[PDB]
Design a protein around this ligand. Structure first.
Ligand SMILES: CC(=O)N[C@@H]1[C@@H](O)[C@H](O[C@@H]2O[C@H](CO[C@]3(C(=O)O)C[C@H](O)[C@@H](NC(C)=O)[C@H]([C@H](O)[C@H](O)CO)O3)[C@H](O)[C@H](O)[C@H]2O)[C@@H](CO)O[C@H]1O
Ligand SMILES: CC(=O)N[C@@H]1[C@@H](O)[C@H](O[C@@H]2O[C@H](CO[C@]3(C(=O)O)C[C@H](O)[C@@H](NC(C)=O)[C@H]([C@H](O)[C@H](O)CO)O3)[C@H](O)[C@H](O)[C@H]2O)[C@@H](CO)O[C@H]1O
Lengths: 237, 247, 38, 286, 237, 247, 286, 38, 49
């Protein structure tokens, strides 16, 4: 009942028969920008189905010594489908996100992944005073990996990361995590190519293990923008 | 008496404080008020008046030549005629305007701007131009096919001599600000470019080089915040006669 | 204001009246929106 | 036409337009009126309830700031063998450029003036004396003291303020005292009935003389005393805004100009140059 | 409809078939001095038609290298007709002004003149600390010319001069400019021989040009005092 | 005027005082408020979220290995698996948690704590554990027969993956406090121990060593008092770039 | 869900439980929700009317403290032949770790800032001079003074506060001045349209520049003057709490980390080590 | 507050509203006491 | 394109709906598989995990 779930947006749908309810970040739900909070005065374009749909990124392999993975939003999708086109042709964008992380294995496998959506995850560099560079941060669709997940690559800690919207994928329990993200920013809209509102982090707190036949166990991320709005139309960057 | 205690800040002189103070001349009767034309109550009233942009701010252009942009009959099509940097908080064609000068006494701004151009060629001269506003993000467009994708107005020369390009307030944040970095995400406004839509066409006895005068002003959805000293004036020494005021 | 002369009072930052048109449209005949100016 | 404005105007959503005889984007600069084209008529807009305030640009606030108008340093010592322990200053608001340029954004101004006097001292070390000073307001061209100890300082009718260096800066308000309904920031005329008078100087616009002395007799050693006077206009009414000053100021007595040696603000070019009218300064190079 | 106009005052009238509406400085209109604003207690003389009429000054020639012209009021008219006589015989005067600047050419000519009425136009001298002299300021009916119109001969700028009551004469559009000026001063009346309330400035921002037959293109100024009042009668100065 | 007199305390600057003070920018209009997700109004809201305890804080355990406790199939009965020191005001498994970090900005605390453990072995793995909370007074129990006498929960692994051990507020005084003496009668909370109730049992193809992740949080009957600087952060020199802020 | 809480919740007495299908102590951490097991369901409780207040943990109080944000010492003397009697400080809240860590417990913060300025002096003995200082607020990247006596100090529009060392610390409130609805304590982005900009630094979150000078001319001898600035946020709104900082700070410009040389707070181990997971530190040895 | 700008006022320590569930139970379907979570 | 992510479990089968998406009311056979009035598009299957 709270273990099965179907998500349908646009021409895309996803089902899971081993879910664990689902998270609505801070108890909120995505919505379009109201007139009393608007700033940009040009009429926005609201593409709906062409952008508010699931985009599946390339999978990653969960290995015995993996440290974790991360994908920044909207960067990860800024070059995918019609969402990517609207982003490139407009100076301003706004949207929520429906995140679905997938990972199945066997009843003989064990492992636990923390799936957390971090707002404003400003990365820090290790053992140097030089700030992270553009290429250290903007990985796009491929995403990046954690160097020191223990401190969330920012000098804090993964132990307290549960203060952020999250779920876990504990192999003996579930095979997917779902998190709904509302627009999260101090401004009603933003320039999509230089600022990432959210960072999806998937970290194996308990490593993958088993004594049965060894198989490649992938982790897959599907993300659907929600209530997309774009302003400041011009040429593609 | 009343028991009291002094708080931090006591005795200080804050130039922006607001208190009453001892009248120097008790019982003084100020001259009666008289109606005078042109009273202004909010500086926003002043920046709504359009003034001339110094678009031709180039070496070789002297004085008033800098206040007009000359366009000529072209031999090629879709020609780029000129562009205009848009930070009303930095030095450029928009700085010495009513909106630019007053805005520079502040640090934050918000609102739509309007650019009006008046064609000053002869009556027998005709033409169509396209004025484009490109929101920030990339490099300034250099071709009409690219500029045309942004906000724009196609202008046809005729009896009504002037066209207005509205630069709508399109910003992620409520306000934009000055911080001396023209490429900052909270400062860059984008670009304005002008191309021939068709061409300037004139008969043999009309001048084949004509001028445009561009004006700019704020609309009434404008707002300015955080007063600061203007960078447009300064002094190194005493002005002539200043010391004589003590003699 | 505890002083006896009113001019000694603190500032008066409450006059929100405006009339931009005396500077923006000082034309004798009002210009209608959309209609050709001339 | 007149109305109460407390926030920037809202924006109303607009639709597609294709109407014959209606051309809101066309205007006629020749009429002298500023374009009345609204954003809603130039592009398709959305509805925006604008809550941005407009109070920081109120004239009262724009000019309502205590700005430096006078700075005078003199030697406090035995002047047996120059400002001998006192000075006289003909009040004017044309010596310091920041205040001057702002006031000159208007043609006429009516306001009361809050005066604040700040004093600092330095030994020419055994400590700094807490001196008592006297600032006496002496009307236009009126009789001023000629010695630190003349009888004139008895100030029988002139207003005088006595203050200590250890006290907070002295402060008092000079009322709007012009013989006219407003001060003339600019005056296109001559102040006298003859032809040799000074141009652009209306005596009616000179608040007066400020005579400041150290009350204490000189000490065995000399000190440098600096007096700074600040003025803040309040209860302000302003008329006829003007083109802002661009050329550096040359004199406190006139609007004479010369311009900087090279742009910006040179007589020949106010704005700095760019390579050409198609050269975009600070172009984004991604 | 707003391109044709007839102005009639006293025994004078002017028509234009190529106007551009007309300007009422600061949205005001001339009027006689009301009792609640009066200072001088002697009964004033109100000549009406003998003074409130159009006075046409000598024309000037618009040349390819012209810098601009100016006329100060009331100085320019202090020696013309009955207005001039009343001015010379009275210590005090008061009036508004109806200004009409004229300049026609050909449909093959181009040029743009800024016609602005500047209140208290205090001139500055160039490259010297010495203030302008009496003869630099009082030109009378002949008026003067701009040395550096770019900065309005006062260290400011012509670019922002539009903040003052004005119109333009753009040859392809109109052949005349009309500006109505109310009494502008901090006092209800003034001594006409030592103070000028307004300065009419006509500056070619866009130079005169054509490729057709070259002809002398004049610029003419006609000024009509309005609601004239004079006080302090004595002998003529 | 009004007769007055200054009281002791006059002129002082108390960092915790609460008074109004002169506005630097008169007539400034702050940016309009906008709804933002996740507003927090009381720090007690933050400590109610459970976070990971660093139970395996031992030499040889690096990084995340310290955040999980491994249990193996036992050969003997009633085996002790691990214990956890309980002073949320001292360094130990509970210090770097949401409740621990925030509590350390205070000196007094009161309320129930909750420890939740999630079993992360394979689905085919089964087992029963007993988690015990022993109120203060003696030495930490080392046998199940002794620990079992205190507050406890017997946990059976199954579909519901996690168990919660409530550490009820059991104190003589209204609040407990930190004073750097872990054995003080007003500081010591007691102990938490975990023993096999039965045993961890798994088939041949399941890993025979499984991990538990322990979390802790405060319940809503919690209260913190007496703010103090946190001992979890400090500096000896200027941070890099600090002095450059003056250049 | 939202409600007014003024005291810790009461406890209700509970009885024995033996109900099939009801297992309050079991939970599912995977859902992301924190355990909802109540004490009453875990053990048998008594009734307790809890009167413990919760006001000291209100965000307004938690962050409502004047914390040191700037400390600058300079030499006040004749600098004929370094801060020459004045300095400029780009305001930031990242230099002192105690305030920084607390602010960083949140993602976004909206607040007005009470600024208090404390000044102390020491002779480089004949007594301590009661100097007058000027602190001028100069907006972001705006024009700052280059000399103790430049014209810039005339402060025509910038706000300036003049205070004496003998007076109580100067104080004033800077309003919430962000161009956004709240300050970004953390910023996962680049402040410019090009790719070479600084990461994690949103200019919109820099309150501005603080320019402080000694107004007095130099004395015959030199002094060391130290200026301390304190900031206290008020009228606070906070959003999205975050994991507390564990690794020592390295720079004011980023979150770079290295960790202590040995636990506690080393990159490899945040908590200090104990012999084993069955070793009870501070075990009571009765 | 004797100052004209409201932001100059003393602190506001009277907001006792709370909603821990936005952090403790951000699940779409509410969890009932005693009932199996899954 | 249009899709469904299928998770193996108790419910053994998944359904992919191929919605009627055509410009014309009907599609037709004319022996030319690449004709604009015949080609329906494609169905592909990839491993999600
Ligand atoms: C400081 C910075 O971020 N960049 C500097 C460049 O801007 C500078 O190049 C010159 O910049 C000039 C800026 O124009 C103003 C201004 O500050 O906005 C215009 C003011 O009206 C003017 N004020 C006065 C009283 O004249 C002001 C002033 O001249 C300068 O501050 C004095 O240097 O300049 C302008 O655009 C010039 O044309 C341009 O070359 C370069 C020069 O090397 O240095 C950069 O650090
Ligand atoms: C002071 C006292 O009563 N006992 C001392 C022992 O506690 C100490 O043994 C070490 O204690 C360490 C305590 O952990 C903290 C703390 O003070 O709570 C944890 C803080 O986060 C940490 N702060 C920072 C910025 O790193 C702090 C700090 O490192 C120390 O104060 C610096 O010394 O420590 C911890 O548990 C160690 O693992 C433990 O060995 C002994 C050491 O000889 O001295 C006793 O006096």
């Amino acid at each position: 009942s709270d273990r099965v779930l179907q998500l349908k947006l646009g021409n895309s749908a996803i089902v899971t028969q081993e879910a664990a309810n689902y998270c609505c970040a801070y108890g909120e739900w995505p919505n379009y920008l109201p007139d009393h909070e608007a700033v940009a005065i040009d009429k926005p374009t609201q593409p709906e189905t062409s952008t508010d749909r699931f985009y599946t990124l390339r999978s990653v392999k969960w290995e015995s010594n993996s440290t974790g993975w991360w994908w920044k939003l909207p960067d990860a999708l800024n070059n995918i489908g019609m969402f990517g086109q609207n982003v490139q042709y407009h100076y301003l964008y706004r949207s929520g996100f429906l995140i679905h992380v997938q990972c199945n294995a066997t009843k003989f496998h064990q492992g636990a992944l923390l799936v957390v959506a971090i707002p404003e995850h400003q990365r820090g560099a290790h053992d140097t005073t030089t700030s992270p560079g553009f290429n250290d941060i903007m990985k796009g669709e491929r995403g990046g990996t954690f160097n020191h997940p223990y401190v969330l690559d920012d000098g804090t800690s993964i132990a307290c990361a549960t203060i952020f919207p999250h779920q876990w994928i504990n192999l003996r329990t579930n095979n997917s995590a779902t998190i709904v993200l509302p627009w999260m920013n101090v401004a009603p809209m933003d320039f999509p190519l230089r600022h990432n509102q959210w960072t999806l982090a998937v970290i194996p707190v308990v490593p993958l293990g088993t004594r049965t036949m060894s198989s490649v166990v992938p982790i897959t991320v599907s993300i659907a923008p929600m209530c997309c709005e774009f302003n400041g139309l011009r040429h593609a960057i | 008496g009343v028991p009291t205690y002094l708080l931090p800040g006591s005795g200080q002189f804050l130039t922006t404080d607001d208190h009453s103070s001892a009248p120097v001349l008790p019982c003084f009767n100020p001259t009666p008020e008289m109606h005078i034309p042109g009273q202004i109550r909010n500086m926003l009233e002043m920046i709504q008046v359009e003034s001339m942009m110094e678009i031709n701010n180039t070496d070789g252009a002297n004085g008033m030549e800098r206040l007009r942009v000359d366009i000529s009959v072209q031999a090629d099509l879709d020609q780029l005629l000129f562009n205009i940097p848009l930070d009303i908080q930095l030095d450029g064609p928009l700085r010495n305007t009513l909106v630019g000068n007053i805005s520079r006494y502040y640090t934050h701004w918000s609102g739509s701007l309007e650019m009006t151009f008046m064609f000053c060629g002869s009556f027998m001269a005709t033409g169509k131009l396209i004025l484009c506003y490109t929101p920030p993000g990339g490099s300034c467009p250099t071709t009409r096919e690219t500029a045309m994708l942004g906000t724009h107005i196609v202008w046809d020369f005729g009896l009504q001599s002037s066209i207005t390009l509205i630069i709508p307030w399109i910003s992620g944040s409520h306000y934009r600000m000055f911080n001396s970095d023209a490429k900052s995400t909270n400062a860059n406004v984008g670009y304005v470019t002008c191309f021939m839509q068709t061409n300037l066409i004139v008969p043999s006895e009309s001048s084949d080089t004509c001028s445009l005068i561009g004006f700019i002003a704020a609309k009434d959805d404008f707002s300015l915040r955080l007063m600061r000293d203007s960078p447009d004036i300064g002094q190194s020494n005493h002005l002539h006669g200043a010391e004589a005021a003590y003699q | 204001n505890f002083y006896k002369d009113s001019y000694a009072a603190s500032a008066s930052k409450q006059d929100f009246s405006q009339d931009p048109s005396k500077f923006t449209e000082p034309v004798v005949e009002g210009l209608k929106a959309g209609a050709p100016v001339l | 036409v007149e109305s109460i404005i407390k926030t920037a105007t809202d924006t109303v959503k607009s639709e597609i337009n294709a109407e014959l005889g209606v051309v809101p984007s066309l205007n006629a600069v020749e009429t002298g009126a500023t374009s009345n084209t609204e954003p809603e008529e130039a592009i398709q807009t959305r509805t925006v309830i604008n809550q941005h305030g407009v109070s920081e640009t109120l004239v009262e606030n724009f000019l309502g700031r205590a700005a430096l108008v006078s700075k005078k340093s003199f030697e406090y010592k035995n002047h047996a063998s120059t400002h001998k322990n006192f000075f006289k200053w003909t009040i004017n608001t044309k010596s310091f450029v920041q205040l001057r340029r702002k006031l000159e954004l208007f043609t006429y101004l009516r306001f009361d003036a809050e005066i604040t006097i700040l004093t600092t001292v330095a030994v020419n070390y055994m400590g700094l004396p807490d001196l008592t000073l006297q600032a006496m307001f002496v009307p236009t061209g009126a009789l001023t003291p000629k010695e630190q100890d003349s009888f004139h300082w008895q100030s029988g009718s002139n207003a005088s303020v006595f203050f200590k260096i250890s006290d907070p800066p002295a402060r008092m308000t000079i009322p709007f005292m012009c013989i006219n309904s407003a001060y003339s920031v600019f005056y296109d005329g001559f102040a006298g009935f003859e032809k040799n008078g000074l141009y652009g100087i209306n005596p009616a616009d000179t608040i007066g003389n400020l005579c400041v002395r150290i009350v204490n007799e000189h000490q065995p050693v000399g000190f440098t005393v600096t007096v700074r006077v600040y003025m803040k206009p309040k209860h302000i009414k302003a008329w006829a805004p003007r083109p802002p000053r661009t050329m550096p100021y040359m004199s406190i007595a006139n609007a004479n100009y010369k311009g900087r040696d090279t742009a910006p603000n040179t007589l020949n070019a106010i704005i700095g140059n760019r390579a050409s009218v198609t050269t975009m300064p600070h172009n984004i190079v991604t």
